[PDB]
Amino acid sequence: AKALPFA
Amino acid sequence: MKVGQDKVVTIRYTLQVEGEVLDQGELSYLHGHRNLIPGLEEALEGREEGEAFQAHVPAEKAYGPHDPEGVQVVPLSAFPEDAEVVPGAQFYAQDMEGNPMPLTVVAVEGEEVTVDFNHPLAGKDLDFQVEVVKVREATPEELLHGHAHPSGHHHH
Ligand SMILES: [Cl-]
Ligand SMILES: [Mg+2]
Ligand code: NI
Structure with missing residues (x-):
């Protein structure tokens, strides 16, 4: 969820 | 490397x-x-x-996957009264200790807003x-x- 790349 | x-x-x-x-x-x-x-x-x-x-x-x-339980139905009052509460608008709710929780507005009807807390x-x-x-x-x-x-x- 908060994990990137986070578009 | x-x-x-x-x-x-x-x-x-x-x-x-x-x-x-x-x-x-x-x-x-x-x-x-x-x-x-x-x-x-x-x-x-x-x-x-x-x-x-x-x-x-x-x-x-x-x-x-998209979680159906991340879709909630909340009062239109919780939003600023000059806010553009419209499909696709993003807002941030806050929990009891202040953590921001982003949501996307899905639909609006009467005094009710369908919002989605799922990641977009x-x-x-x-x-x-x-x-x-x-x-x-x-x-x-x-x-x-x-x-x-x-x-x-x-x-x-
Ligand atoms: Cl990192
Ligand atoms: Mg290059
Ligand atoms: Ni905390």
């Missing part, structure tokens, strides 16, 4: 969904500490600096183009904190 556990990895990427570029940018992350969506970390594993490739990551290995990419398969810009070992401080210094997007 190759991407692997406990390396700080810098990547440049393009993110497309259903053939539309949604995002481009550059970020650094500590590999092996669940800092990146899992399908992407799996695609980067063992890649050499300078490698550039394209990768398809199913929703299951990206932001997860939940349920979507992602197509990436990725370039491995740099790989280095992490410092003790980084390994102790579980993240890189600095930790995120150079450019977004």
Whole structure:
């Protein structure tokens, strides 16, 4: 969820 | 140097969904500490600096399936009274200790707003183009904190 790349 | 556990990895990427570029940018992350969506970390594993490739990551290995329980029906009062409460508008709720929780407005009717707390990419398969810009070992401080210094997007 908060994990990137986070578009 | 190759991407692997406990390396700080810098990547440049393009993110497309259903053939539309949604995002481009550059970020650094500590590999092996669940800092990146899992399908992407799996695609980067063992890649050499300078490698550039394209990768398809199913929703299951990206932001997860869309969770129906993340869709709520809330009072239209909770929104500012001059706010544009409209499909696609983003707002942030706050819980009892102040944590911001983003939501997207889905529908509005009467005194009721259907809102979605899901990640906007939940349920979507992602197509990436990725370039491995740099790989280095992490410092003790980084390994102790579980993240890189600095930790995120150079450019977004
Ligand atoms: Cl990180
Ligand atoms: Mg280049
Ligand atoms: Ni807390």
